Amino acid sequence: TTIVSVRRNGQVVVGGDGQVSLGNTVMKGNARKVRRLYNGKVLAGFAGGTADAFTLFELFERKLEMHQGHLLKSAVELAKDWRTDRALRKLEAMLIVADEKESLIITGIGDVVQPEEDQILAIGSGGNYALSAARALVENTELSAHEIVEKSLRIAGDICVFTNTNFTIEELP
Amino acid sequence: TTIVSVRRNGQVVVGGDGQVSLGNTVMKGNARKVRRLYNGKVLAGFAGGTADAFTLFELFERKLEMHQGHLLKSAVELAKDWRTDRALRKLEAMLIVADEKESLIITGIGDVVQPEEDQILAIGSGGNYALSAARALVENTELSAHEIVEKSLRIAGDICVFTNTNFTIEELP
Amino acid sequence: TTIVSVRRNGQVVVGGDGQVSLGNTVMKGNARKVRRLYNGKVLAGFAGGTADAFTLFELFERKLEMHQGHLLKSAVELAKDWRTDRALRKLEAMLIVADEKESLIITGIGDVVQPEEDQILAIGSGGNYALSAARALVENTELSAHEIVEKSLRIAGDICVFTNTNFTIEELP
Amino acid sequence: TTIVSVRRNGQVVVGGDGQVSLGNTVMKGNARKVRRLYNGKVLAGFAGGTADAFTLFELFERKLEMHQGHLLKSAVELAKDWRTDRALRKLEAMLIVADEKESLIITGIGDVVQPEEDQILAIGSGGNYALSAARALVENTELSAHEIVEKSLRIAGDICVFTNTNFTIEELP
Amino acid sequence: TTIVSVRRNGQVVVGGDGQVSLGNTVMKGNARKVRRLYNGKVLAGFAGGTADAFTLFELFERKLEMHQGHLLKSAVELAKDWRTDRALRKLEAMLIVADEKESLIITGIGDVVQPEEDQILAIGSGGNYALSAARALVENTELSAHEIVEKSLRIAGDICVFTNTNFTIEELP
Amino acid sequence: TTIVSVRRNGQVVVGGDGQVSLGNTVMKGNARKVRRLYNGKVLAGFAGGTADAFTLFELFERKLEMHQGHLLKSAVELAKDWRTDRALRKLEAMLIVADEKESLIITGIGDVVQPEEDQILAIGSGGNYALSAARALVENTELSAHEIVEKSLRIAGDICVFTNTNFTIEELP
Amino acid sequence: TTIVSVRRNGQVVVGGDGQVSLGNTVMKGNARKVRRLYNGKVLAGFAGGTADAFTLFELFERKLEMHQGHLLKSAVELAKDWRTDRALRKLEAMLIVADEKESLIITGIGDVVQPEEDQILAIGSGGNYALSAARALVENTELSAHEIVEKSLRIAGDICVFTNTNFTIEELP
Amino acid sequence: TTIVSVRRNGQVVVGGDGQVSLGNTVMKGNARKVRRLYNGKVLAGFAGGTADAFTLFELFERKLEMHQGHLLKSAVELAKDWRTDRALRKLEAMLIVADEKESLIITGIGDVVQPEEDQILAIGSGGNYALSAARALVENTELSAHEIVEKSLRIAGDICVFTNTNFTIEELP
Amino acid sequence: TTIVSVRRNGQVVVGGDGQVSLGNTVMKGNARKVRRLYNGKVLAGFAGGTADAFTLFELFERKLEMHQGHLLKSAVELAKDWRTDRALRKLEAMLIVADEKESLIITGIGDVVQPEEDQILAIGSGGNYALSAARALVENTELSAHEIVEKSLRIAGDICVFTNTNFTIEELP
Amino acid sequence: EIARRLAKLANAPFIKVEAEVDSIIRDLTDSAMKLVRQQEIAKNRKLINPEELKQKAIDAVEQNGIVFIDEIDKICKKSGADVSREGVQRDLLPLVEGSTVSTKHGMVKTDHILFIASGAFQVARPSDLIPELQGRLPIRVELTALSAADFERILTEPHASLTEQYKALMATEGVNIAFTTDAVKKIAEAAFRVNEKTENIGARRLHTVMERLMDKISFSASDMNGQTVNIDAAYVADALGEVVENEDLSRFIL
Amino acid sequence: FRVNEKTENIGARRLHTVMERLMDKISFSASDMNGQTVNIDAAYVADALGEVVENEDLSRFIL
Amino acid sequence: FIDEIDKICKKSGADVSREGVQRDLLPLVEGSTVSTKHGMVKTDHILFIASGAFQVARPSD
Numbered sequence A, B, C, D, E, F, G, H, I: 001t002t003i004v005s006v007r008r009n010g011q012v013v014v015g016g017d018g019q020v021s022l023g024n025t026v027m028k029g030n031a032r033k034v035r036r037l038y039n040g041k042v043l044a045g046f047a048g049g050t051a052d053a054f055t056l057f058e059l060f061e062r063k064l065e066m067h068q069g070h071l072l073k074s075a076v077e078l079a080k081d082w083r084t085d086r087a088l089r090k091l092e093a094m095l096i097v098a099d100e101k102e103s104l105i106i107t108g109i110g111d112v113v114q115p116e117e118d119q120i121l122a123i124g125s126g127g128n129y130a131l132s133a134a135r136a137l138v139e140n141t142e143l144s145a146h147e148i149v150e151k152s153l154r155i156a157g158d159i160c161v162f163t164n165t166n167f168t169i170e171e172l173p
Numbered sequence J: 001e002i003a004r005r006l007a008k009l010a011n012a013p014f015i016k017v018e019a020e021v022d023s024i025i026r027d028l029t030d031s032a033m034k035l036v037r038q039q040e041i042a043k044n045r046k047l048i049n050p051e052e053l054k055q056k057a058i059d060a061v062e063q064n065g066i067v068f069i070d071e072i073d074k075i076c077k078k079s080g081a082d083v084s085r086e087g088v089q090r091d092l093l094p095l096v097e098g099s100t101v102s103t104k105h106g107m108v109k110t111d112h113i114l115f116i117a118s119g120a121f122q123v124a125r126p127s128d129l130i131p132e133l134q135g136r137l138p139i140r141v142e143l144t145a146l147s148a149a150d151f152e153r154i155l156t157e158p159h160a161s162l163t164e165q166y167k168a169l170m171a172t173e174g175v176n177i178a179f180t181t182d183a184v185k186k187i188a189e190a191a192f193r194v195n196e197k198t199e200n201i202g203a204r205r206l207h208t209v210m211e212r213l214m215d216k217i218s219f220s221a222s223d224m225n226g227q228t229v230n231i232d233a234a235y236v237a238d239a240l241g242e243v244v245e246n247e248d249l250s251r252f253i254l
Numbered sequence K: 001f002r003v004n005e006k007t008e009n010i011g012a013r014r015l016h017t018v019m020e021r022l023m024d025k026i027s028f029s030a031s032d033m034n035g036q037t038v039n040i041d042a043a044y045v046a047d048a049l050g051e052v053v054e055n056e057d058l059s060r061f062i063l
Numbered sequence L: 001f002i003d004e005i006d007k008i009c010k011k012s013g014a015d016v017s018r019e020g021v022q023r024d025l026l027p028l029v030e031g032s033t034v035s036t037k038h039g040m041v042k043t044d045h046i047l048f049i050a051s052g053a054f055q056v057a058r059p060s061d
Helices: A050-065 A071-080 A127-140 A145-157 B050-065 B071-080 B127-140 B145-157 C050-066 C071-080 C127-139 C145-159 D050-066 D071-079 D127-139 D145-157 E050-065 E071-080 E127-140 E145-157 F050-065 F071-080 F127-140 F145-157 G050-066 G071-082 G127-139 G145-157 H050-065 H071-080 H127-140 H145-157 I050-065 I071-080 I127-140 I145-157 J023-029 J085-091 J093-097 J131-135 J148-153 J162-169 J204-213 J233-237 K013-022 K042-046 L018-024 L026-030
Strands: A003-007 A012-016 A020-022 A025-028 A034-037 A042-048 A093-099 A103-107 A111-113 A120-123 A168-172 B003-007 B012-016 B020-022 B025-028 B034-037 B042-048 B091-099 B103-108 B111-113 B120-123 B168-172 C002-007 C012-016 C020-022 C025-028 C034-037 C042-048 C093-099 C103-107 C120-124 C168-171 D002-007 D012-016 D020-022 D025-028 D034-037 D042-048 D093-099 D103-107 D111-113 D120-124 D168-172 E003-007 E012-016 E020-022 E025-028 E034-037 E042-048 E091-099 E103-108 E111-113 E121-123 E168-172 F003-006 F012-016 F020-022 F025-028 F034-037 F042-048 F091-099 F103-108 F111-113 F120-123 F168-172 G002-007 G012-016 G020-022 G025-028 G034-037 G042-048 G093-099 G103-107 G111-113 G120-124 G168-172 H003-007 H012-016 H020-022 H025-028 H034-037 H042-048 H091-099 H103-108 H111-113 H120-123 H168-172 I003-006 I012-016 I020-022 I025-028 I034-037 I042-048 I091-099 I103-108 I111-113 I120-123 I168-172 J014-018 J066-070 J100-103 J106-109 J114-117 J176-179 J228-231 L033-036 L039-042
Touching: A003 A042, A003 A093, A003 A127, A003 A145, A012 A034, A012 A042, A012 A093, A012 A145, A025 C145, A034 A050, A034 A168, A042 A050, A042 A168, A050 A071, A050 A093, A050 B111, A071 A093, A071 A103, A071 A111, A093 A120, A103 A120, A111 H050, A120 A127, A127 A145, A145 A168, B003 B042, B003 B091, B003 B127, B003 B145, B012 B034, B012 B042, B012 B091, B012 B145, B034 B050, B034 B168, B042 B050, B042 B168, B050 B071, B050 B091, B050 B103, B050 E111, B071 B091, B071 B103, B071 B111, B091 B120, B103 B120, B120 B127, B127 B145, B127 C127, B127 C145, B145 B168, B145 C127, C002 C042, C002 C093, C002 C127, C002 C145, C012 C034, C012 C042, C012 C093, C012 C145, C034 C050, C034 C168, C042 C050, C042 C120, C050 C071, C050 C093, C071 C093, C071 C103, C093 C120, C103 C120, C120 C127, C127 C145, C145 C168, D002 D042, D002 D093, D002 D127, D002 D145, D012 D034, D012 D042, D012 D093, D012 D145, D034 D050, D034 D168, D042 D050, D042 D120, D042 D168, D050 D071, D050 D093, D071 D093, D071 D103, D071 D111, D093 D120, D103 D120, D111 G050, D120 D127, D127 D145, D127 E127, D127 E145, D145 D168, D145 E127, E003 E042, E003 E091, E003 E127, E003 E145, E012 E034, E012 E042, E012 E091, E012 E145, E034 E050, E034 E168, E042 E050, E042 E168, E050 E071, E050 E091, E050 E103, E050 F111, E071 E091, E071 E103, E071 E111, E091 E121, E103 E121, E121 E127, E127 E145, E145 E168, F003 F042, F003 F091, F003 F127, F003 F145, F012 F034, F012 F042, F012 F091, F012 F145, F034 F050, F034 F168, F042 F050, F042 F168, F050 F071, F050 F091, F050 F103, F050 I111, F071 F091, F071 F103, F071 F111, F091 F120, F103 F120, F120 F127, F127 F145, F127 G127, F127 G145, F145 F168, F145 G127, G002 G042, G002 G093, G002 G127, G002 G145, G012 G034, G012 G042, G012 G093, G012 G145, G034 G050, G034 G168, G042 G050, G042 G120, G042 G168, G050 G071, G050 G093, G071 G093, G071 G103, G071 G111, G093 G120, G103 G120, G120 G127, G127 G145, G145 G168, H003 H042, H003 H091, H003 H127, H003 H145, H012 H034, H012 H042, H012 H091, H012 H145, H034 H050, H034 H168, H042 H050, H042 H168, H050 H071, H050 H091, H050 H103, H071 H091, H071 H103, H071 H111, H091 H120, H103 H120, H111 I050, H120 H127, H127 H145, H145 H168, I003 I042, I003 I091, I003 I127, I003 I145, I012 I034, I012 I042, I012 I091, I012 I145, I034 I050, I034 I168, I042 I050, I042 I168, I050 I071, I050 I091, I050 I103, I071 I091, I071 I103, I071 I111, I091 I120, I103 I120, I120 I127, I127 I145, I145 I168, J014 J023, J014 L026, J023 J100, J085 J093, J093 J131, J131 K013, J162 J176, J162 J204, J228 J233, L018 L026
Parallel strands: J014 J066, J066 J114, J176 J228
Antiparallel strands: A003 A012, A003 A120, A012 A168, A020 A025, A034 A042, A042 A093, A093 A103, A103 A111, B003 B012, B003 B120, B012 B168, B020 B025, B034 B042, B042 B091, B091 B103, B103 B111, C002 C012, C002 C120, C012 C168, C020 C025, C034 C042, C042 C093, C093 C103, D002 D012, D002 D120, D012 D168, D020 D025, D034 D042, D042 D093, D093 D103, D103 D111, E003 E012, E003 E121, E012 E168, E020 E025, E034 E042, E042 E091, E091 E103, E103 E111, F003 F012, F003 F120, F012 F168, F020 F025, F034 F042, F042 F091, F091 F103, F103 F111, G002 G012, G002 G120, G012 G168, G020 G025, G034 G042, G042 G093, G093 G103, G103 G111, H003 H012, H003 H120, H012 H168, H020 H025, H034 H042, H042 H091, H091 H103, H103 H111, I003 I012, I003 I120, I012 I168, I020 I025, I034 I042, I042 I091, I091 I103, I103 I111, J100 J106, L033 L039
């Protein structure tokens, strides 16, 4: 899996491949790894174990509908669920959520992370690959946050044996 | 175990061998790995640990009788049971369910998967073998979804040391 | 890697992918895993460790060179070199060799193997796939030998994370 | 693999399956695991590593060739080539050799073994199975030597995932 | 431990050795591994961990007294106890139960298994040995289900280092 | 630890060393490993983890006072506590209990074991040593059950690095 | 395997079982683990790997043959061969050698050992057992040397799963 | 992570880098590892697992607001939560807290530690590095508790592959 | 850690070093490992995991205040808490408690141990060292229980890499 | 039945309970104001004087009292998460022992009452009861299971038998019904043939059996008045059908 | 007593249960046998009840 | 009339109380004497009708 997100020019994009890898084989190579939440207010990209991916994706949807779509908060409220006396298991996966205002990354271990100056985000196996590509682009070119996230995914699919070229990208608005 | 399912020409078939392998020996070589559910409305093929196979097979029957045989949903409703705060253990097995309309695959980890354009499904040790055979067939021949699923099982039994030629195939209608 | 060779109608073809995986990254995608030996009269596909592959492949040539290019004998004479009171390094790779008259498969541990009745051989990680595929296409269609190789390689590359679709195919007129 | 040999009524027979398992897949199903040596006067069945099998089997021949085919001696001579300061590698295989007068079993570690009173020998993964069977049919029936082998191989191939029913049997008139 | 059961001529027998092996030593070599349940209506042979053997033996007695001795069912009712949302630990052992009508095998993992055409049953370390013997006999001789089960136990005790000749056999009626 | 018990001539003895071994060192070499229960009606010898030794020793005292000192039963009643749906942990130790009538051995896993014809019992690391000695004695000499149990302990302490000569022996009456 | 040797009254005896265990199965049960060397004047019992045993045993003979059969020296000279830098196969077996005057025990790593004061030696898996026994019968009875061996072997074979009761005994008049 | 704190001249400082290391990669290199608690009464530096870092940071905030900012106590009250009959999991991280009066270190295992004469504290991977630096400074120079903690962090970042030069330092008042 | 206690001449002392070792580094080298309980009626020395050390130290304080300082009993009452059906976790540490009358050692596993004739106690990594020293002293010299415990600690710090010379000793009265 | 036909055929307050505790007594008294105010209102015949009969009804219960505890086994040890099963068996001791319950009629003693506890005891056993009760329940009576021939009898001989009950309930319609002997077997053997292949509810099985039998007649007895139809072998058969084991196996068994 | 040492020792109450088994033969047919004086002695008490059951126990859960 | 009865059938180990209701409701279908605020009312002859979807459990449950 390779999920990367670039934000440039009031534009926010979040792309990811579509290779459901099982062991060293391929169960399906077209899945949607980036979905839309809150009727289309926030973008979400998951990466991890098919199951624990959703168990944390649908677990962040709750905290969104239960908080008028207040991203930056709903995230934190989710995290807090892991920082108690009675934990919530642990989830083998990470989420990249972003709306017209913010963009974040949430781990199933219970923590939220904010990008750095650039605002590039990437998670999954082929992460850093797409990341290095993005940063490479964002910093040396005047490219659309979409075109980058697209281009960056490719670079990554051509290196990660667990990532393909058939990806799905969602942007706002 | 090798469970494969092909859908072509309004025909839906689901076959699987019958080798109950224990370690590297053979406890029985005639078992039925594909059963019928809902008086004959849905086809089900299991693959995994004898026990956890049924514990998940009988667990999907409930969600069927409790939902007027609405496959595509009953599945999801089953999955959701693993995506909570209080999980349902974990089941070492996978299910391939299909009726006159849809066909799916459900893991005991809690997730549902839909086929790709070709609508071919396979699970178990000899999976991909039967799968590669199916695809091979379905794509280059005008063969009955039954004949394929039959032919595909053979190819697989002749490669997986954990699969035999004595299989049971069920189709609809 | 994935290498498969089918023969039917005085035609012998050996084809393989070109993905050189390194761990879980990809060092290269356009490699030629199948080449011609002994004055373009023998086909040889190798799969295993990038080096050992060559080292194996390279020894088999010596042998071909030393024996008027008698595919069969050369192979054995080579295999023999491990089966001695002595011993050779013990190369981590396999080869699929085949000329106008024969088709064989040689391993680094030192043993030759003839195909089964259908005259189809496959080696590599995505072998059985390519195989399963081929077997099916040979048994259920009057398809061209070369074509079967082509179709099966794909099916396999599509199932194996360590096999791509950039192929290299050599047939023996 | 499974190889067993029974002898009763001036008859000696050695039989084995023909499944060449590779990991848990099957590279071949029609192998000949038992062959004739020293001018069709000795029976040899080998089980273990496709290579080491041969390398062992081939050494025992050189020896037979060197000693007027004295089964017994040859065997010891070969074995005694292991009991010294010098070694001969640990050959991952066992042999069942037998001629008109004797019936022996040689291992790669270098030791010969005589059957117990019933003169029945079996080696391979499905050995004890074929043995148990043989022992049963020898003690409780006036069944043909060749037949017992035929029978027992089956019983064994049906319990061992690594043994098939495509047999190869050689008897010594 | 070696528990085998043969059914032929309206006769049902269930035998087992009596070697309580601990590690590689012998704590006792006369134990009764086959007991009688329901005042003498059903035969039961256990094989596994001394403790978990009984914990599953006495656990099947309940389901019997609580069901008028309806074997085939009581078994299933026991199995279902492992196929829930709240499991029953797991038991390192297997049971072979049979009465005048049926004969089964139940694992502490929670599953029931029915014999094959020859309905012969065997569990424990020396299983398949006694099994191969039984099958050998049952198929090529007109022997009493008792004599077989007796004879088959011996063969096994002479191969399994964890099985002795001092066994206890119970038949019906 | 080495606890052995011999019964001969209406005499019942139970001896054990006194080396509290911790790792490969000695924390104390005089402890009492055989205590008296029920005002002096039953003898008890423990062997295992200092803690789990007592947790099972004191756990058998309850079942004794709560059952008028009915050894053979109280034991079983204790065992049953491990054979339920809700187990009692597991105890790293074993107990040897005997009174004027019976003598047994109970494991913290939940099971009771009766001696064999000779009525000799031994548990702990140096078990079988003392056992082999006892048996040796009991069978070839007219020695007091005490003198044997004494003599047998010595033999064992001189072989087990985890057993000493400073032991405590209790007999009845 | 179990080999023990006692000496008392100008009598020396070496005895051992005959079970050749292969993993947990039994390849043979009538082996002769004790033999006579140097023109029937020295007793040798070997225990360890069927192979290495012989190679060790065989070396000790080449030595006895080279030194007028001076048990003691020969043994040392043998151990000496290992006791340098010049590495030796480092055989994994032990020997109990003894003639009219001496009784020794040699290991494959290269060292000789004299018995304690009683003049009892035991090697093999069930050694200590046979030992404990012998020790007991020597200290507490005017039993025959040969007899103690006989009895101890049994006691041991009855506790060791890797030792049988089919014995082989040689004494030195 | 590298968190160090020096106290000299009524000055208390607590610095730490900002490298969020994941595996051997860098997810972010600017995070704040030292935060302010109780409107600015106490300094806190965490080091450990992103999640368990906070779960223990926010867990010490509670014990502070619930105790009028009584550091030295609130700490102990937190510790006690791990020293019961019902523990609080365990936290993979450590905290360094200090106010105008005291300075401490609390582990997620449940224990509080007071500095030594010098009152220098350091936790995390690059701990002892910064520590050795501090001590080095504090003892041989008249440097501001801030300048030291700054200087010491650098030394550490230049040695720990898991620590950077981009750090955040907080002092009081 | 090295805690040793000697009792001679109505004098009872309990010393221990002060090296808080973490991994192979030193977090602090002056801690107090021997504290006073019950206003100064009993001496207590702990050794183990900083946390589990106290969790068991403070856990024995309760049983003391709740029992009028009846050492020998309060200990036992503490132990019993681990010998139930519902255990108290397990504590990685040991305690050495002694008052004007008795002196003991309690493990977090749940067991109490009394000294031997000499009444010398030692726990922790450098235990036996200090112990061997004590015993050495106590038995061959007329030295104050304090001077010994002091001297003994030194010997141990000079051998254990996990023990220092900076120790704290408490005696009574 | 044997405990109920020991209240009407011996006249005494009866009460069956299935394991408050004293309510077993408070209710034993509320079922006595029917053999004192229905036997002394038709015998001694106003006569009101409750204050007079608040020791004429109790003098009855105190002595003539029968308590029935159906399915008692259900309260025996084995049961660690619910030791309350031994609690009931305990709070029920004062009653079998001897105490004074305060009813809405006055204080009623128990010492002399009579208790009868039924139990299948397939799971636990007698000795699995608190020692107290084991000694205050000295009579151990062992009943037997009802056989094939036992349903052939319980179907007629007894007063109010099923044959009789449906005979009279179908005569009040103007119809007559014949229950031949060769057809009582195939009605008693067809009720046993059902208990050996499902729950063995015993006699009650018969009820469910007849109901299926008189399912054809009980409906159209009006439009067919004044007829005498014979219920024999061939009729009983083509009346219900065939009962075979579900399929159990083929579902969740490999 | 011989019964309390081989099962629950309910004490005196054991006696009640004992007699009930003893007078189980007489208490039933006392009507059809009116005006008789029968001696209850050793030989009568014996052939009145039978003999104790020392609970299987081993037979099952024991090896 | 007892609507939705199936809801009280076994399968149900953390709440055996579903078999308790089905048990305390036995005396009524069997035959007892309830004490109402009008007097003692017998039941033996009443008429019960229980409805159930029985999709989950079944009669025999």
